[PDB]
Design a protein around this ligand. Structure first.
Ligand SMILES: [Mg+2]
Ligand SMILES: [Mg+2]
Ligand SMILES: [Mg+2]
Ligand SMILES: [Mg+2]
Ligand SMILES: [Mg+2]
Ligand SMILES: [Mg+2]
Ligand SMILES: [Mg+2]
Ligand SMILES: [Mg+2]
Ligand SMILES: [Mg+2]
Ligand SMILES: [Mg+2]
Ligand SMILES: [Mg+2]
Ligand SMILES: [Mg+2]
Ligand SMILES: [Mg+2]
Ligand SMILES: [Mg+2]
Ligand SMILES: [Mg+2]
Ligand SMILES: [Mg+2]
Ligand SMILES: [Mg+2]
Lengths: 104, 271, 77, 149
RNA sequence: GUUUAUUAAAAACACAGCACUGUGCAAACACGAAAGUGGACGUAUACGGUGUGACGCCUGCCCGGUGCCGGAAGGUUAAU
């Protein structure tokens, strides 16, 4: 449908709940007959600057080929969850599959 | 939709109606009605306590759910109705088990939507959940002051209250007057602004339209004799004195709040 | 009625005397307070609309002595 | 307010002590909780000849009634299957009485006034610790696991 | 539209509108020694008070005096 690139930033004390969040989000996409192309946890990572009075965050990259209606449902899940701090969804021209330069 | 009336007569020259075509064009729901007898502003002593109240059209009282206790059970909105008792429109809702109740209609609510109270309710305009479950920075109305007491804040036609902070047991509110007040974090609140936001755009147009609403005319104090009012008297128009009440209390500027019980709950006054 | 149940105090009338000795009639109200007293024998609380003088009497005589007097007076509590 | 004590109170005296207190402290707290008797000379001869050691017998059987009950509360798990949201974020909180309801169901028949909590809400879904005040002095702790329903 | 029943119907009062100000709810306020009641089974798009008086164009300068609001360092100052 519409290729999106989703990266979100988890509160680092909620790093344990991260694979529980990813499986729900994949089941949101694949349950809505969307594709998921790569899915790359980046772990805890030192922030460039302290967002929200704290210095580290847990990064997750996720590439998604879903219809635009369920992504807008997915964005509200990032908005009201307090575990995720920042979320960025970026529309992509195609489906990307190659590993990240920092997964390397 | 505001409708300017065409000037076919003076008294219709300046009338702006507020026409909402979504209101129910029928009788209200009969089990939820009860008698609302008029008072004339007179207490059990028969004396006029508050002036200028009297007359007006007969009004039946609509029992409105402010406590909003049916948790978990979803409810669909049957129709929107006119309420003479208040400035905001009310919504007749139908729970799944067959109970009908009246709530205050929020802004974007229309006939056929689903609402639901309780803690596990979603966050859409219409749900009612305790403010430790509502995210900080959202606009809510029908706000309780005490848990389970019923909603008391932001009930008039276009009002709302923002939730600006939370420190454990309390949330800090931005009331519609601009006053910052602490409320316990277990008090219920209803999401979204309350509905009839264009209520303040009406203009009654003629003197009789205030008598329809039971507002008797106000004689201004300087038009009296000195036995009647402190402002009264004079040979011509004389007002050489500071503006007071009919009981001699300064009005232009003098504060009157004397509640030392609730001063711990007020963060900042209105500006 | 502003009457202490223990001591029988009552609003008396007197005068406000000014500096120019102008007399206007006033009242002297007793310092009444509703207080729950633990009766240890009957194992319950008893509310008495009692003045602060009467609370000093209950602290001296004991609540059992005073409630004997209130029944001997014939007063509900 | 001269008063004789029926139990040791943490800042003024032990059993059998005639210590000046304020009037509101005896009249509202000490006497209505059975902790003190006002020092009437009829009550002193009532107390000092007989109950200076008779109540010392009754004070030991109270601490022995605790030390039997407090000792067996080392099972150190309380599974409260309350409703919760996902990834933490408990639906409905657990207060002191709900903790008291479940330690009743496993161990001592305990009351709601025995539970001591730093938060009180226990909003975090997972395991927690709960301190006790089964005596005025002798305290117990039980690890409590709040479990999603 | 209202008004001096019985010498004054008017330019007087009222009025829709406008503004100032008070008022977070056990509201301000009012009647009540009090309990209570009205405001209101309303909740700041609400309510009370005050001035002005549809609408159109507008509403300038003065805070010294008198009020009101805010201030709390100093001076003064009651019972105790
Ligand atoms: Mg009025
Ligand atoms: Mg007016
Ligand atoms: Mg007038
Ligand atoms: Mg005149
Ligand atoms: Mg006068
Ligand atoms: Mg003149
Ligand atoms: Mg002049
Ligand atoms: Mg005289
Ligand atoms: Mg005429
Ligand atoms: Mg005449
Ligand atoms: Mg005539
Ligand atoms: Mg009242
Ligand atoms: Mg005029
Ligand atoms: Mg001017
Ligand atoms: Mg000035
Ligand atoms: Mg000045
Ligand atoms: Mg001042």
């Amino acid at each position: 449908m519409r290729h999106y690139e989703i990266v979100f930033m988890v509160h680092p004390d909620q790093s344990e709940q991260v694979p529980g969040m990813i499986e729900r989000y994949t089941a949101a996409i694949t349950g809505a007959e969307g594709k998921i192309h790569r899915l790359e946890d980046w772990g805890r990572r030192q922030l460039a600057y302290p967002i929200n009075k704290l210095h580290k965050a847990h990064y997750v990259l996720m590439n998604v080929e879903a219809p635009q209606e369920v992504i807008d449902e997915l964005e509200t899940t990032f908005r009201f969850n307090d575990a995720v701090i920042r979320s960025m969804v970026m529309r992509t021209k195609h489906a990307v599959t190659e590993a990240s330069p920092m997964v390397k | 939709a505001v409708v300017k009336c065409k000037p076919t007569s003076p008294g219709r020259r300046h009338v702006v109606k507020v026409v909402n075509p979504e209101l129910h064009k029928g009788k209200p729901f009969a089990p939820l009605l009860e008698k609302n007898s008029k008072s004339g502003g007179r207490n059990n002593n028969g004396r006029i306590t508050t002036r200028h109240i009297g007359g007006g059209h007969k009004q039946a009282y609509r029992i409105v759910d402010f406590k909003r206790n049916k948790d978990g059970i979803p409810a669909v909105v049957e129709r929107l109705e006119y309420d003479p008792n208040r400035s905001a429109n009310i919504a007749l809702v139908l729970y799944k088990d067959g109970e009908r109740r009246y709530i205050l209609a929020p802004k974007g609510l229309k006939a056929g939507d689903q609402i639901q109270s309780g803690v596990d309710a979603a966050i859409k305009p219409g749900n009612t959940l305790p403010m430790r479950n509502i995210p900080v920075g959202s606009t809510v109305h029908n706000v309780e002051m005490k848990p389970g007491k019923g909603g008391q804040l932001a009930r008039s036609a276009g009002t709302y209250v923002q939730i600006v902070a939370r420190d454990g047991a309390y949330v800090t509110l931005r009331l519609r007057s601009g006053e910052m007040r602490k409320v316990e974090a277990d008090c219920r609140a209803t999401l979204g602004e309350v509905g009839n936001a264009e209520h303040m755009l009406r203009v009654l147009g003629k003197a009789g339209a205030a008598r329809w609403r039971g507002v008797r005319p106000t004689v201004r104090g300087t038009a009296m004799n000195p036995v009647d009012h402190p402002h009264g008297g004079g040979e011509g128009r004389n007002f050489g004195k500071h503006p007071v009440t009919p009981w001699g209390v300064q009005t232009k500027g003098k504060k009157t709040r004397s509640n030392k019980r609730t001063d711990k709950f007020i963060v900042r006054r209105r500006s | 009625s502003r009457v202490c149940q223990v001591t029988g105090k009552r609003p008396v009338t007197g005068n406000n005397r000014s500096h120019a000795l102008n007399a206007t009639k006033r009242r002297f109200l007793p310092n009444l307070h509703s207080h729950r007293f633990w009766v240890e024998s009957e194992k319950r609380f008893v509310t008495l609309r009692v003045s602060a003088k009467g609370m000093r009497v209950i602290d001296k005589k004991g609540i059992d002595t005073v409630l004997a007097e209130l029944r001997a007076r014939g007063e509900k509590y | 307010m001269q008063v004789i004590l029926l139990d040791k109170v943490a800042n003024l005296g032990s059993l059998g002590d005639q210590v000046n207190v304020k009037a509101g402290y005896a009249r509202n707290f000490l006497v209505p909780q059975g902790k003190a008797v006002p020092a009437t000379k009829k009550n002193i001869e009532f107390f000092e000849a007989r109950r200076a050691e008779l109540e010392a017998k009754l004070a030991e059987v109270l601490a022995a009634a605790n030390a039997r009950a407090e000792k067996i509360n080392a099972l150190e798990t309380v599974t409260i299957a309350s409703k919760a949201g996902d990834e933490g974020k408990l639906f409905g909180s657990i207060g002191t009485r709900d903790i008291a309801d479940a330690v009743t169901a496993a161990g001592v028949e305990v009351a709601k006034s025995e539970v001591r909590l730093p938060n009180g809400v226990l909003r975090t879904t997972g395991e927690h610790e709960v301190s006790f005040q089964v005596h005025s002095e002798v305290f117990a702790k039980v690890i409590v696991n709040v479990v999603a329903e």
